[PDB]
Amino acid sequence: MKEVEKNEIKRLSDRLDAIRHQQADLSLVEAADKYAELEKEKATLEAEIARLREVHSQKLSKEAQKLMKMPFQRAITKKEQADMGKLKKSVRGLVVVHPMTALGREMGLEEMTGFSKTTF
Numbered sequence: 001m002k003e004v005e006k007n008e009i010k011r012l013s014d015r016l017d018a019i020r021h022q023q024a025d026l027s028l029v030e031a032a033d034k035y036a037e038l039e040k041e042k043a044t045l046e047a048e049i050a051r052l053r054e055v056h057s058q059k060l061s062k063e064a065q066k067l068m069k070m071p072f073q074r075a076i077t078k079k080e081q082a083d084m085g086k087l088k089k090s091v092r093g094l095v096v097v098h099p100m101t102a103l104g105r106e107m108g109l110e111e112m113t114g115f116s117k118t119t120f
Contacts, residue, residue: 067115075111091120
């Protein structure tokens with residue numbers, strides 16, 4: 001489905017990036033005005049996108065936030081790692097997140113993790 005949502009995060013990023021590079025060219029000495037307002041525009045851009053990303057921190061993501069409040073869960077031993085195929089099917093579709101992947105690096109995971117609504 002793709003959703004195109006990723007294009008929007010790229011957009012607001014390009015906005016702030018262009019602003020701080022614009023303030024790279026602008027010194028606080030030569031632009032004790034233009035640089036200062038751009039600091040304000042920045043300050044509010046942040047405050048906004050962080051008000052948004054506090055909604056999206058308290059509720060980190062949809063899936064993520066529910067993975068955190070899951071009933072039956074763990075980080076999977078090498079024993080059930082070798083048996084991933086019999087592991088995931090018995091649970092009736094388990095949810096498994098890898099540590100070295102970005103999602104696992106960000107949520108803090110140093111081990112292969114699993115999660116479900118069903119026992120395992």
